[PDB]
Design a protein around this nucleic acid. Sequence first.
RNA 1: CAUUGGUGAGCAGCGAAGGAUUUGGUGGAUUACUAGCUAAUAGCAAUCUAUUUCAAAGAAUUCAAACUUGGGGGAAUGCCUUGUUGA
Lengths: 94, 850, 61, 834
Amino acid sequence: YKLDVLSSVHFVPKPASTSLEIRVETPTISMEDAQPLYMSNASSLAPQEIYNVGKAEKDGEIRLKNGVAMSKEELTREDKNRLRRALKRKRSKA
Amino acid sequence: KNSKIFSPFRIIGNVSNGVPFATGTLGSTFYIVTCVGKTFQIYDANTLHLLFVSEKETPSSIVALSAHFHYVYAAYENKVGIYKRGIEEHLLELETDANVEHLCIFGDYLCASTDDNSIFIYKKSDPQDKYPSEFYTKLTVTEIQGGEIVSLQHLATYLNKLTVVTKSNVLLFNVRTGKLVFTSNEFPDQITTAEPAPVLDIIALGTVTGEVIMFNMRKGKRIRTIKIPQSRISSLSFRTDGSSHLSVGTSSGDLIFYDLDRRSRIHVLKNIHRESYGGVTQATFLNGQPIIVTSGGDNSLKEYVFDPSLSQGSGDVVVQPPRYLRSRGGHSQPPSYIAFADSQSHFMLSASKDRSLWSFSLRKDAQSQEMSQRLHKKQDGGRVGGSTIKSKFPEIVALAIENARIGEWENIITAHKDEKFARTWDMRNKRVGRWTFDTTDDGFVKSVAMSQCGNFGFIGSSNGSITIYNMQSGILRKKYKLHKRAVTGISLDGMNRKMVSCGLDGIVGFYDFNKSTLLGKLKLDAPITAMVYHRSSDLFALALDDLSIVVIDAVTQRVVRQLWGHSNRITAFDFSPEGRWIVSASLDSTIRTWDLPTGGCIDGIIVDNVATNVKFSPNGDLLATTHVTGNGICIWTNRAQFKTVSTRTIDESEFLNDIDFNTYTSLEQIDKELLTLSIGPRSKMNTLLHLDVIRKRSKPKEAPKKSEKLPFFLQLSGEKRLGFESHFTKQLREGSQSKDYSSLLATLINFSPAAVDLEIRSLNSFEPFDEIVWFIDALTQGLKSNKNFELYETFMSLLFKAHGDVIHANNKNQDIASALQNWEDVHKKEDRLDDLVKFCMGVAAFVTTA
Amino acid sequence: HLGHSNGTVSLWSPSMPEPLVKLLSARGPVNSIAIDRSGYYMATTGADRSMKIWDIRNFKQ
Amino acid sequence: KSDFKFSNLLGTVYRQGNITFSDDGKQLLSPVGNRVSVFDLINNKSFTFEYEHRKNIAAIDLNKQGTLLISIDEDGRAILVNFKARNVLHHFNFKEKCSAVKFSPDGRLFALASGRFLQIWKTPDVNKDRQFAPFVRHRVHAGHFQDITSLTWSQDSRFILTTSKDLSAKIWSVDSEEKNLAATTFNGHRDYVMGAFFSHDQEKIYTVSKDGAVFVWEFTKRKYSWRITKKHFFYANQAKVKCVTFHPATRLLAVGFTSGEFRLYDLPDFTLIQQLSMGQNPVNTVSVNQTGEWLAFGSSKLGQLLVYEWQSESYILKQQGHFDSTNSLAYSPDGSRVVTASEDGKIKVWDITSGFCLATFEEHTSSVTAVQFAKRGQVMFSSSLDGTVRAWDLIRYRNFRTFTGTERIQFNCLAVDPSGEVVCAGSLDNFDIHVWSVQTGQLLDALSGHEGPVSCLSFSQENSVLASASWDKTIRIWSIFGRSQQVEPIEVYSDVLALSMRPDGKEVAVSTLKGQISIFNIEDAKQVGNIDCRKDIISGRFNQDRFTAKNSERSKFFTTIHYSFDGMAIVAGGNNNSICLYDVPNEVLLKRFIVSRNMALNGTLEFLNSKKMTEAGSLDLIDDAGENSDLEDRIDNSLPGSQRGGDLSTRKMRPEVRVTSVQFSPTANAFAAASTEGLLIYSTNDTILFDPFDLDVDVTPHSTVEALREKQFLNALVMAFRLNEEYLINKVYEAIPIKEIPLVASNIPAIYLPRILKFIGDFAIESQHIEFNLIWIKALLSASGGYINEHKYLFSTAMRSIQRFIVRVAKEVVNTTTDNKYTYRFLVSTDGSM
RNA sequence: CAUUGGUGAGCAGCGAAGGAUUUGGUGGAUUACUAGCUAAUAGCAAUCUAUUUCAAAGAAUUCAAACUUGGGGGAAUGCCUUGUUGA
C-alpha cells in the first residue's frame, strides 16, 4: 500500500494466484447494499450448481450426464458394449 | 400599474445626483450615505463598498440627507424618514403642504425647515429614545427677519441654539423657549452654502460671488474673508487633522484648497466633477484624517488624499497637492443600448449618451468598471489617425456580444452613432479591441451581430451591404448584397448554417452561410426596425412600423405569430430564455409581455418614464430596463421563476385552467375498461412481494449491545370485544353488511407496506371463515373497478403466502370456492394484457434488432 | 511550571521523574502562567474566568 | 435536443456537514460537495439543485413549513433556496466561519452560530417577492469566549441555547423581556461541549461534551437555580464524542464517536438502548425525524451515508459514494442503471431515479479503469490494474471467469464483442491487444503491431470490426473474425486517446492530443472531417502553478468521447473543467458545460485571486494542518509525489478537477459525465422550453383543444405535436378513446414518429395507465413498423425507452398476475388434507 | 546568386496643436454588497471609572492520556514495568 502510492498507482501485477472460495445460496436481494430496491430476484447458486446428475448408488443402474438413466438389466448386449466402450474413452482421456 | 410577472429589484449604476451627501461616523470608521432619486444608498468610506440601500422607494425625491451615528435622516417631500440599515423604522410627518428644503440634528432635537421659511422642531420623547419623535413647536422666520433659508447648522457648545443661515443674514433660535436670541447683520451678497468650523463660535459662509466669509457668533463679526474670482461657492469643509485647511467647492467644477495659517491657496483641482451637472455639490474632509470626499451631480463620488510632505524640517509649507484615490462611477447620461455579458447574469454592458461604455455588475456593486478606450498600437506600423486631444467614442447604438471565445480575441462589436466603421471590444481585458470594422459602401452601421462560434462579425450597413468580418485578424471575408435600403438586423442561427436579415424595405432575406446561396426571401408589409433571434428554437421576432411584432420561424420560412396591441413605436424587445415570452417596450409608455403559444399579451405595465431597452437574462431570473430619464438600469425580478403565471389576455381590460396555468394533471383512469396502476411509487408492489427478504438483508451483521434494564413498554412510552377490534376489521365488518367494499379498499391503499404484512396475517379465520371470504370479495370487487390492478393482485398473492396453508386444507368448501369462482370469473378478463405485452415485446425485439 | 487541563500547575526538574510539587491553581484548564524574577511569586490564569497569585516559597495562594 | 440542464448528481451521497430530514420522514437532505441533494426514501426519486456553492457546505437547515433551504460554505457564504420552485432566493454573506444553522420550530426566524457570536435573523417571507435585502437581523448575542460549535432551539420559539469550544453553554431568550426568565450560563465540563438540549418539558437541560460526559441540569434547590443533578459518562476509551442530537419527545441521544461507534440512551434513565459499529471512520453528523425513528449518520472520510431505524433494528440505507475516484462509466442497456468503476476497486451499480447504489463488487484488489456492458444487460466486464479483466453476472452477482494475461500486465481499457464471444483489453506496459474468449478463459490471440500503448478499444455493433487507439499517433483498425486477420492503420497527427464508434458502424471518432477531434470512415481510410477543440476548453490554474491558465498544456485535449445514439452529436470530456456537445455534420459545438465551481477543487478558476499571493508563496499552500484541534487531522501521512493515489489524505494537494469518462444515456437525451465531485447527470426532463415545429398562424393552444371538442382526433394530436409541448400532448393523448386509436395511429405523419415514440417512452414509465399505454404501442408498432426498421438509428433512443417500460414495469405486473393465476389453479383443483 | 544574419543611411505609405520602447508608486477588481467597538437582549463611538463588586452556578476515570518512534544490534548508569528488603 505504501509502495504503490509512491509509484503513482501503476502497479506491476502478482504472477500467480490460485484460490478456492465457498459461496452460500441466498436469495440475491440479500447480496446487495441496503437500499429499498433490487435488480436480481433469484438465488445466488445456479440451478445447475445445486443438482448435477450423478451416477446412481446402485450397481444395477447407470445414469448418463444428460439424465438418460439406464439399468444394467434392460440393456442389450450390443448396448452393453457401446456403453462400456463409451465409458472407456472418457475414463482414458484423463 | 401593478404587474403580475415582474417586480423591481433595484436600479443599477447610480451613485449620486446632486443632493449633498452626508457622512456618519461609527466608532473609528466612516460611512457615506448618498441618494439616488427616490432611494438612498450607503457607502463605506474605507473601500467604498455598497453597504445598505433603502427597503422601499420613497414617494418623491429625497431633498436633503443627514446621518447621526446609526440613524440616517432622509427628507423627501412632506415627511422625514428616520432610517436604520435602510429600514424605515419611524416615519415623521411635518404638518404643512410645503416641501422640506433642509434638515439638522443635535441633542434631543430634530430641526426640519420647509421651503416657506418655517422651521419645525422635533424632540426626543425620552432621553433613552434614540430618534426624536414628538413635535415640539413650529419656529417661523418672517421676511423682515431674514431671507430664504440657506441651511440649518448647529454649532459646537450652544445649549439649544440653532444657527439658521439665510440668504440675507444669520439667526439664532433657542428651541427650548422658541426665541430669537441673536440676529446677525445683513450681508451684501446672496449666501449659498454654510458650514461650521472646528474652532469655537465660527460658522463659514459661502456667497454667490466668490467670497468665503468666516463669521463669529460670540462677537457677531466677520473675522476673515477670502475672495475667489468668478465662482459660485457650493460646498465648504475644514480639515480637522491639526493642519488648518479650507476646501472651497465651486459650482464651476473647481475644488479649491486654502491654508488659513499661511493665508495662501495650496492646490486647485480642475473639473473633478462636471460643470454642467452642477460641479462639486458637496465636499467633506473626513474627521481627523487627510481624506476629502467629493461628490458632484454627474453621478460620481471621488475621494482625494493629501500625501505627507516631502520636506523633513519644513512640513506645513511644502504641501503635497491632492491625489486621486478610489471612486465609484455611473453614467452621467441615460443609457442608449445595453446587453448582458454572460450566462450567470454577472455583468452588463451599458453604453450611454455620456459616450463611455460601462461593464456594470449585477452581482457585487463595487465590481463595475468603465471599459477602457485606449487604442492598441497597430500591427501594421503606420500610426493611428485621430485627434491628439483625445475625445471619447461617439455614442453606441448597436452592440453585439457572443461569449464563446472570450479572453483570446475580441467578442464585442459596437456600432457608434454616425460612423462609417464600427469598433470591437474585448470583454475580459475591458478595452477597445484592436480591430475596427468598415462597411465598404460608405453607409452608417445600424445593426451588428456575431456568430455563436465567435469567429464572424456581421455588419449591417445603411445601404444594404452585409460585410462579414473575421474576428482574429479583422480581415474581410464575405460581402452580402440583398437589401437596397438600410439593413436593420442580422443574425446567424445556432448551427452556423442559416442567416437572416431584415431591411427597411420590408425584405426579410434568408441566407445560407455554409454555401453562399440565398435560400429564400420574404417580404412583409411595413419597414422593419429591429430583430431579436432566438438561437435555441430558430424563432425570431421583428418590430414593424405598423406597430406589430411579427415572429417568423427560421426553418419553415413563414410567419408563425403576429402580435397586435401596441399604439406607438416599439423601442426594443427580447425573447425569454426559453422562448415562451416576448417583452416589448414602446413609446406608448407601456411594457407588455407577449405569450408566443397563445399569441397574446398576459401583462401590461404602464411606466410613466418610457422604456428604451428591455433585455432578459440568459438565465431565467432578471429583466433589465433602461428608461429615457434617469441614469441607472432598472432590474426586474421575475415572479415566473417562483410561481406559475396565468395566460389570459388581460391587457384589453386594463387599457381551461389546464391551459391558463399551462399544466395538465393526468386522468385517474380514462375509461372503466382500462386497467391502471396505483398512484405513487412503483416500488409498492416489490416491497409487498419482498418484505421478508429486504428486512433480512437490512439488519446489521452482529447483535447490538443492550443493557439489561430496558422498559418493556418502551414503544408506548413516548413522552408528549368489538370496540377492542381494530379499524380495518371493523370497516371490513360494516362493509360485509352492505356487501360493498369501496371505502374498505381506499384504506388498503393508504396502509404502509409494513402494515399490510401485519394486517393480512391477522385475519382470524380457523373454523367459520368469515373474514377470508369477506376479504376475497373485496378484491373481486376491486378488479371489477379496474383501478389499482397492480396492488389488488399483490393483496391476493399475499393471502396465499399467509393463508395458503389454510385455504388449501379447506378447499372445496362451498363458501370459500364461491368467492374463488367469483375471483376466477373476474380474474379471467385481465389476461388481455398478458396477450398484449407479448405482442408489445416480440415486435419491438424484432423491429430494433432485425 | 507546566499547566494542564486539570488546572494543576506542576513544578518539574530534570533529575526527578515525578513532578516536584503539584498546585491546583484554577478550575478548568490553565491559559497561561508567569513567575516573578525574584522567584517568590506566581500568577496563573485559568479558563474559569479566574486568576491566582501564588507564593512559590510557601505554596500558598 | 440542445438545452441540457444539470438534473442530478449521482454518487457521493454525503461529503461534509449537517444532514437533515424533511418536516415529514420523507425527504432526506444530505450535503454533497456543493449541492443540497434531495432524496425521497418513500416515493423513490432523487433530486439535486442546480445552484453551485462556491466551497463545501458546512451546514443545512430546512424550514418546518417545507419551503426554505439554507446552505452555508466553510467560509460563510449563504444561499436561500425555494423548494417548490427549485430556485435561489437570495445570496447572503456572513463574514466568519459558520457551524450550525437551525430555523425556529415556529419557522419565523432562524439562528446562526457563526464564530463566537449567536446571530438571530428574521426569515424572509416566501410569498412576498424577492427584494434587495430580504434578511432582517433580530439580535446578535456575543457572550462566548471561543467559537460556538453547535446550537439548539426550544420547542416553543422563544428559547435558544448554544454550546461552544469555550466550556460554557448559555441560554438566550428571543425577546428582550424574557431575558429575566433565563440568562444563566451552564459550565463545568472538562473539554468541548458539543451539544445541549431540552426535554419535552422545558424544565430539564442535558449537556453533552467531547470528553464523554452527560450532565442533567435542573432548576432545583440547594432562590434556587440550575444544579447538576446527575452525571452520566459514555466511557469512550480513546474515542471521543463528535456529533450528538436528541429527539426530546422520545428521549434519544443519538451519539456519534471518533472510533466509528454509535450509542443510544434514554435520558433520565441513561439506559443504553443499542450500540453499533458504523464504520472504521468517525461519525461526523447525526439527525432524527420529528417522529423519532429514522436516524441518519454520515462518516465523511469515505463519504458514506447511513439511515438507521432503531426500533426494528434495521437499516434503510447504508450507502457509500466515493470521491475523486471513479474512472469509468457505463449506462445499462436499460436507461435505469449506471455502473461506475473506482480507484478502490469497488464496482458499484447506481440507480438514476432513486440515487443510491444497488450492489457493490468487491473482488478486485486495485483500481478499475474500464467498464462496459454486453448481451442485453446480463453481463458486465471490467478491466483493472490488478492484472485481470473480470466478467460479472447481473442475475447472480458473480464472476464468470477472471481473464488474465500471460506475463501479468496492467489493463487500461476494454472492448467487448456485441455478440458476447470476445473480450479485448489493452495496456500501458505491453502495447499488445490481448483477446479473450468468453467461454474459454484462455487468451485466443495477442493482437500486436502498435508502437506505444493502447489507449482505448471499441467494437462496431454492426459488423464487429474493432479499432484500437495508440500513442504512436495511429488508429489501427482490426478485423479479427473469420479467416481474414487483416489490419489497416490510419495515421493521425498526435497521440490519440479515447476512441468511440458510431452505432452505424461506419465512423470512428477520435480525440487526439492537439485538442482536435477527428471523424474517420472505416470502409475507407479517409476522414470525413475534424472539429477543433483547443479553443473552447476551459482550463484551471492550480494553486501551486507557475504558468498562466492560458498557456498550460494540461487540459486542452479530451480524454473521452461518446457519440449519441442518433449518431449526430459527440460529448467530450477530459482533465479540464468543461464538457462539450459538438454537432457532427455542422461541425460546431452546441453548448459548453462547466462541471463545477469550487475553490476547494483545484482546476476550477481561470484566474486566481491576487491577495492570496504573499511574497513567499500562495496563501493556500500553507499547511493549516497543525492548527487543528484534534490529533487525527494533524497527522500528515501524505507520501511525497503520490498523484491520483490510494487515499485522499495521501495527496497533500487539493483534488484536481477532471471528467474521466462520459457516456450518453440510451433512453432520454441524458448523458452522464463521471467527475471528481461524483457522477453528474444532465437531462431534458424539464421541457420548459418552446421548441415549435411547423407552426401556422392558425395553430394556438386554444385551437388544438377546440379540435378535441369537435372530435377531430388526428388533427388535435398533430396540432399538439406542432407546438411540441408536453401538456397539450397529454391533453390530447389521454383524451381520445380506444375505438379510434388504430385509426389515428396509422394516419400520423412520418415526421412525428420520433416525437410520439419519445413521448410514450418517457410518459408511460411514471404514469398509472398500463392498459392505455400498451394499446398505443400495439397500434404504433403494428400500423407503421416498417418505417421504424428503415430508420433504426433515429429511433434507438425512442424504442429503448419503450422496451425499458415493457421489461421493468409491464412484465412484473404480468408475472405477479401469472403467479396469481397458477397458485389459484393448484389450490382450487388439488386435494385437501387429513 | 541566396541570406530565414548584425549595423546604418534614405523613399513610398500611414500621419488633427507629436510618436515609440522600458519602468517606480498608489487606487478599483480578481467568489455574491446587511456598517465600527466592548464586558453585547445593552452601552459607547469625547471613556468606562468613585456601581464592577457580592450572590448563584461550577471539581469523573476516587491520580484515563506519546493513536505521533527512520532500520539493524545493545542499554553499564538512567527511566519504565513487575517482584522484593526495610521503616
